[PDB]
Amino acid sequence: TTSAGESADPVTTTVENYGGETQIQRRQHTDVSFIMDRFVKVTPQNQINILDLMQVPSHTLVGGLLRASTYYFSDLEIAVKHEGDLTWVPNGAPEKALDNTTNPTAYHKAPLTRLALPYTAPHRVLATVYNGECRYSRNAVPNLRGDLQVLAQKVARTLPTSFNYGAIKATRVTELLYRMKRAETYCPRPLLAIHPTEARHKQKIVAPVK
Amino acid sequence: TTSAGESADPVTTTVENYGGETQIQRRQHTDVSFIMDRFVKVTPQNQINILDLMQVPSHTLVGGLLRASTYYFSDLEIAVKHEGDLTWVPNGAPEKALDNTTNPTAYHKAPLTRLALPYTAPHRVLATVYNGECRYSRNAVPNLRGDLQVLAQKVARTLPTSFNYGAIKATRVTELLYRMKRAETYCPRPLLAIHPTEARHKQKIVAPVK
Amino acid sequence: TTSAGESADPVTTTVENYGGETQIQRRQHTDVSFIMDRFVKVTPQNQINILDLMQVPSHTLVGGLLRASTYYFSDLEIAVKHEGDLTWVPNGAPEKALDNTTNPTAYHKAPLTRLALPYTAPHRVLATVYNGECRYSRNAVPNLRGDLQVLAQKVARTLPTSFNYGAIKATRVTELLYRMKRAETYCPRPLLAIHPTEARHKQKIVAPVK
Amino acid sequence: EETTLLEDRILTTRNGHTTSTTQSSVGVTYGYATAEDFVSGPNTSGLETRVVQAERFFKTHLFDWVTSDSFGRCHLLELPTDHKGVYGSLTDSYAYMRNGWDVEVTAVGNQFNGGCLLVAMVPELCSIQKRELYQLTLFPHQFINPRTNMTAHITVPFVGVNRYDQYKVHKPWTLVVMVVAPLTVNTEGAPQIKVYANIAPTNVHVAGEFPSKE
Amino acid sequence: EETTLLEDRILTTRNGHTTSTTQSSVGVTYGYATAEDFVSGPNTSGLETRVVQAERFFKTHLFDWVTSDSFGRCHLLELPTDHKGVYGSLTDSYAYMRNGWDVEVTAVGNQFNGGCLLVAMVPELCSIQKRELYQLTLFPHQFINPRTNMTAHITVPFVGVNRYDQYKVHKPWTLVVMVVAPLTVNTEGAPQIKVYANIAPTNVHVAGEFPSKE
Amino acid sequence: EETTLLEDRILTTRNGHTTSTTQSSVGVTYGYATAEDFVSGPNTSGLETRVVQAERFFKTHLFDWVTSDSFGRCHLLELPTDHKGVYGSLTDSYAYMRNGWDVEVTAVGNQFNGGCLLVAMVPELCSIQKRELYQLTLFPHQFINPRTNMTAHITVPFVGVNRYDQYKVHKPWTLVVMVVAPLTVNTEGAPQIKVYANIAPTNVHVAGEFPSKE
């Protein structure tokens, strides 16, 4: 079909335009709740770990797809391999609270601890990217204009301190995995495949035996 | 609004286009009958005066506005300051009739004489401007073509002899004023304000006292 | 009227567009059946004559108008002036059949023989022009592409052998005329008047006496 | 208006056995009225007649619009003008006449020209000062602006202090074409635009038949 | 027609799994008929079959329209021509065939070109004298004129003295493109216009299957 | 779309006592929603107010599109930017604010230019790698392509992790104009195209009134 390309109104043609037939599609696997709901390993800190979803590497399935949203919501599960007992403290806690056992503490039971945690941030939703500051006592943020170069001022910014699901602490934490529960994603952002050197990106794919 | 500018179809926008509100207007003062209906002084001839509205100076309100019409109709009032008795004679009269008192003659009564006169011309309407001749015995008028220069042939033309409201005569007429009664105007023609030297034409306007 | 010239959709204006009036027309004379239905002389062969309508000279009325069609159908009348007896044989006959009298033979009766003959070809219709060959044992015809020059290969082609109304034979045939009966014409082709040297082609037209 | 590079604002005017068609129309301007007033008055004593054979288009060249003409350059044509056809012969066979005018003015260059023409029908045009040209839109008019159109069409009635005229001594109407913005030709416009009028008298009535010269 | 600098006379033709779309359409010309006549006659004894897989567009270059070509310069294409696809293979697998033609001819320059092309579908074209070119409009045709359009579309049926043809010895149709007014390029037109045909056979029927060479 | 050499895709947007009209419209793009979400939540304790006097167009120059700019040349404008009018004074009189944006971007050359601009409204734009520019169409956008249009119009709501913002420390939206195909001027295009934004805040709500400096 011809259309006005400048418009931005989505145009979806079908193989019927030249005598084919559109088939049925079952899209259960590209549903945000389902695909986000699997564990992903993170490299832990020896002892204090603040629970921050932006810790999962950007190349992973969950890191890739979490960064393709601007704002998101979820509850959380973690599974942790640790020495001693594991204490978790909600968003907003003083870090010295990590040492008090009335705060949710799980006693060591081999091989690991898996916990269901609530969303505790003070915000209706959290963001993978945030164009601003949370420290007050500063000078105002500039209203930047210019080309892409102008965006290099922002690289030393850390995401607001309120963007976390609390923190956990144990004597040694050896392994940490996150799993997003009931996930919601808003405002898509770029998702990048590997860029090939060749005409086609080629990989050894799993094939029979000999 | 946008429109086709070449058209000539009147386009009247309102302040509503950006959220204003058009008010009511009372236009009783720019009504032709009302505005034309006031006396205007003319410079009289010592004795015979033919009553010709084109005698009122073009800069006056009534001269300005009478010349902004091509054809017009009205009855007339005159007020005249004169020595002796004032005789008036209709359109078409021999000038020697001005000396015969059975023709409307007003006997001197201080300070002035004001008279209601009928329209007497032989034409359904009169014109402030007329592109032609009334003398027959001539050669035909040319069909001019060319630019504005071509119009300079016409400057020695006097308006047809039939374009008058008669004539009046007294021993000395000192002051003459005309007043158009029941005026009708057809086919508008240009009305010119003063051209300023400066950005705005400035005048002493009537202000309080000190 | 204006129209889209590129279209090819016929546009027939009338004198009504500027206040005239279209009259009635009686077109009985440009009806194909009527105009084709008159005898036309052909130059005969001394003895065997195959009956082939493309023998009538292209400049004649019937030759002119028969070549302005691609495909045609008709029955036929011939009138023949001949010595001896005239035998006719249908389309598809061996030429030696022309000598056997059980085939339609007309015995000499002065001054001439006029015969009604059926269409006998094996084709639903015949053609004045045919872009191909009827001999098999050849090599395939080319698919020509190019300008008008390319058409010069075809000049040595004779119309298929099946395109005839049989043949007649007499001891001497002196005069032969054909007349198309019940004619049908399909797909018009060019009809050319004489090209004048002058602005108008002028001829002595039949006028009174002196 | 209507479509791609050229246009369907398409008008055919008919006057007698003559037609004129434009594809860049913009419409017609009716001046002062939609109909003539009464054609049969006291001054002709029932002796007047319509002569329908004169109601048709005749043509004249007006001027050549060139890049050196400035705002206020005018070309006037007083009406009636010389007509060597049946309208023209009426003016020599009858003492009194009246007719309105159906006027069509053309300025064909192409759509890569710029500049603008005002065409107007002025009654009793005896003189026009320069400053008054700013108010020429007071009169029945239409513009010719290359980017939009090439034709102006004004239809105007008979006007006058008298119901029938004597055209050998008085000219009721003047066609005026005025340059409001100077012609621009850029790399692709027409080097100049010739301006032509196609005029039809409408409703012609005559009274008072003259002798011959026999 | 429809809108500003470019256009909405917009046609999509489908033949098989192939489509063609123009935005400068002008319509299609149907030649001699709206439908084919009977496909199943006595001469095939009920043995004929339709082969729908051949009904689709194939393409060939015709010529390059340049400023030196004069009125009457022609390019003929006899039909059927060489086809290296499934239509082409039918002519070597069956003794008798019949099909009409859906023809689409393109001449893209731009709207600043001038000149004019007549495209026509002529039956049994054996010879054409120069003077007859003035009557080529007798045949199913359409023009290509740059200021209006870039595509011609003619749809024509099977014609012939016989209901099924033998295409190895007879060519029923010739596509002819003729220059009626020479190409003008001015400062902004395309320096020349290449002319291409996009042709689809329609209603192809075959009868009489040949041996192989095995 | 609609007609000959120029066009009737004609839109007038009104925001307050300010209007903007284009004759080459293409429509408006609504981003992420058709309405704002709730303006009155728990975080303002019923103390918020709408200030309708700030909902109107202000203007800024963005950049000059020239033939040497290549695919991926961008110009960002973070929103809100400096406003020296009543919107600008709100940011110094109230601690918390929220508003969406009605955005109009212009690139006027003429229809003989070529090349293409993508205009987009991106939330939380902190960084954009070169390869991600191939997916900028993920965001609320519209193109400016000379042969079709000169205006882009995007209308977007307030977005954020919080229902009211503090604009002195956070910028929710960035207008980005990106060159997708380089400008071509040929013999008749505009030598370069200046790009301008006409932006109106929509639905502005403020809460938390500051002291003065008195």
Short mmCIF file of C-alpha atoms in Angstrom, two decimals, chain E residues 2-152:
data_model
loop_
_atom_site.label_atom_id
_atom_site.label_comp_id
_atom_site.label_asym_id
_atom_site.label_seq_id
_atom_site.Cartn_x
_atom_site.Cartn_y
_atom_site.Cartn_z
CA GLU E 2 -5.98 14.70 -7.46
CA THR E 3 -3.51 17.37 -5.71
CA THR E 4 -0.43 19.75 -5.20
CA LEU E 5 2.72 19.26 -7.27
CA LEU E 6 2.35 15.30 -7.56
CA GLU E 7 -0.94 12.99 -7.80
CA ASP E 8 -3.86 10.71 -6.57
CA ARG E 9 -5.04 8.91 -9.65
CA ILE E 10 -3.76 5.82 -7.90
CA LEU E 11 -4.13 2.24 -9.34
CA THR E 12 -2.74 -1.16 -8.11
CA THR E 13 -2.95 -4.01 -10.64
CA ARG E 14 -2.52 -7.55 -9.41
CA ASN E 15 -1.69 -10.54 -11.61
CA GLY E 16 -0.91 -13.58 -9.67
CA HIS E 17 1.51 -13.04 -6.82
CA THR E 18 2.85 -9.83 -8.60
CA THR E 19 1.51 -6.27 -8.12
CA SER E 20 2.24 -2.93 -9.82
CA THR E 21 1.19 0.48 -8.42
CA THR E 22 1.21 3.98 -10.15
CA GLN E 23 0.27 7.26 -8.65
CA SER E 24 -0.21 8.90 -12.13
CA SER E 25 -2.88 6.59 -13.48
CA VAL E 26 -5.29 7.96 -16.21
CA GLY E 27 -7.19 4.54 -16.16
CA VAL E 28 -7.07 1.41 -18.24
CA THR E 29 -7.99 0.96 -21.83
CA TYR E 30 -9.98 -2.20 -22.66
CA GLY E 31 -9.52 -3.19 -26.32
CA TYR E 32 -12.27 -4.80 -28.49
CA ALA E 33 -13.88 -6.45 -25.43
CA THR E 34 -14.40 -6.64 -21.69
CA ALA E 35 -14.14 -10.49 -21.47
CA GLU E 36 -12.66 -13.25 -23.62
CA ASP E 37 -14.99 -15.27 -25.83
CA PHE E 38 -15.36 -19.06 -25.39
CA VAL E 39 -12.23 -20.88 -24.37
CA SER E 40 -13.66 -24.36 -24.82
CA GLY E 41 -14.58 -25.03 -28.44
CA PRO E 42 -14.78 -27.88 -30.86
CA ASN E 43 -11.11 -27.65 -31.95
CA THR E 44 -9.67 -28.93 -28.56
CA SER E 45 -12.22 -31.73 -27.99
CA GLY E 46 -12.56 -30.90 -24.23
CA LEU E 47 -8.78 -31.50 -23.69
CA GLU E 48 -7.71 -27.90 -22.84
CA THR E 49 -6.77 -26.65 -19.28
CA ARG E 50 -6.17 -23.28 -17.66
CA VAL E 51 -2.72 -22.68 -16.16
CA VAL E 52 -3.17 -19.99 -13.65
CA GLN E 53 0.55 -20.10 -12.60
CA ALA E 54 1.53 -18.28 -15.83
CA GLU E 55 -0.85 -15.32 -15.26
CA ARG E 56 1.63 -12.79 -13.75
CA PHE E 57 3.92 -9.92 -14.72
CA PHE E 58 7.13 -10.21 -16.61
CA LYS E 59 9.24 -7.25 -17.67
CA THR E 60 11.23 -6.05 -20.72
CA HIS E 61 12.98 -2.80 -21.75
CA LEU E 62 11.54 -1.27 -24.89
CA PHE E 63 13.71 1.82 -25.91
CA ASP E 64 15.13 5.13 -24.82
CA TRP E 65 13.15 8.04 -25.73
CA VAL E 66 15.66 10.82 -26.59
CA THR E 67 15.29 14.38 -28.04
CA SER E 68 16.35 13.34 -31.58
CA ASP E 69 13.49 10.94 -32.13
CA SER E 70 10.91 12.52 -34.44
CA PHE E 71 7.15 11.94 -34.96
CA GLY E 72 6.64 8.36 -36.19
CA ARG E 73 9.68 6.79 -34.47
CA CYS E 74 8.25 3.42 -33.27
CA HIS E 75 9.33 0.49 -31.22
CA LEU E 76 7.38 -2.79 -31.85
CA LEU E 77 7.35 -5.76 -29.51
CA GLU E 78 5.56 -8.89 -31.02
CA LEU E 79 3.62 -10.92 -28.46
CA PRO E 80 4.35 -13.53 -27.25
CA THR E 81 7.98 -12.74 -26.93
CA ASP E 82 10.82 -14.73 -25.16
CA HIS E 83 9.82 -15.63 -21.69
CA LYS E 84 12.27 -17.68 -19.64
CA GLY E 85 9.62 -18.38 -16.94
CA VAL E 86 6.50 -20.66 -16.61
CA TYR E 87 4.62 -19.00 -19.49
CA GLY E 88 7.69 -19.50 -21.70
CA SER E 89 7.88 -23.21 -20.69
CA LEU E 90 4.15 -23.79 -21.71
CA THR E 91 5.05 -22.94 -25.32
CA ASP E 92 7.37 -25.92 -25.40
CA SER E 93 5.11 -28.32 -23.49
CA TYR E 94 1.81 -27.69 -25.41
CA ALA E 95 1.00 -27.56 -29.12
CA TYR E 96 -1.91 -25.01 -28.81
CA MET E 97 -2.39 -22.06 -26.58
CA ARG E 98 -4.59 -18.90 -26.13
CA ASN E 99 -4.31 -15.97 -23.65
CA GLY E 100 -5.09 -12.20 -23.68
CA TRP E 101 -2.60 -9.50 -22.38
CA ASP E 102 -2.65 -6.97 -19.51
CA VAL E 103 -0.08 -4.40 -20.56
CA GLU E 104 1.57 -1.73 -18.62
CA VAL E 105 4.03 0.74 -20.24
CA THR E 106 6.13 3.20 -18.31
CA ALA E 107 8.01 6.33 -19.40
CA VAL E 108 9.38 8.03 -16.31
CA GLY E 109 11.09 11.37 -16.69
CA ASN E 110 9.51 14.12 -14.63
CA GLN E 111 6.77 16.79 -15.09
CA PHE E 112 9.28 19.30 -16.60
CA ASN E 113 9.66 17.16 -19.70
CA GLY E 114 7.33 17.68 -22.72
CA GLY E 115 6.54 15.60 -25.79
CA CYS E 116 4.08 12.72 -26.10
CA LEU E 117 4.03 8.92 -26.68
CA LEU E 118 1.12 6.93 -28.11
CA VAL E 119 1.10 3.30 -26.83
CA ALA E 120 -1.13 0.90 -28.83
CA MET E 121 -1.90 -2.86 -29.12
CA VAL E 122 -2.20 -3.76 -32.89
CA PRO E 123 -3.43 -7.24 -34.13
CA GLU E 124 -1.77 -9.01 -37.01
CA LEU E 125 0.81 -6.23 -37.50
CA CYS E 126 2.59 -7.21 -40.69
CA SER E 127 3.35 -3.69 -42.12
CA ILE E 128 2.58 -0.06 -41.33
CA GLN E 129 3.21 2.71 -43.84
CA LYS E 130 4.13 6.22 -42.51
CA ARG E 131 0.77 7.80 -43.42
CA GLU E 132 -1.08 5.09 -41.44
CA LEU E 133 0.58 6.12 -38.23
CA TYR E 134 -1.88 9.09 -38.35
CA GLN E 135 -4.67 6.46 -37.70
CA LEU E 136 -2.90 4.33 -35.08
CA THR E 137 -5.65 5.57 -32.61
CA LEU E 138 -7.95 3.09 -34.32
CA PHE E 139 -6.28 0.52 -32.17
CA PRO E 140 -6.61 -0.01 -28.36
CA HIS E 141 -4.31 2.78 -27.03
CA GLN E 142 -3.46 5.38 -24.44
CA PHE E 143 -0.91 8.30 -24.42
CA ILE E 144 1.94 9.00 -22.17
CA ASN E 145 2.31 12.72 -21.79
CA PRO E 146 4.80 13.85 -19.05
CA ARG E 147 2.77 16.79 -17.72
CA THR E 148 -0.05 14.27 -16.86
CA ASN E 149 1.21 10.70 -16.46
CA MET E 150 4.05 8.18 -16.73
CA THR E 151 2.00 4.98 -17.24
CA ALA E 152 -0.19 3.58 -19.99
#
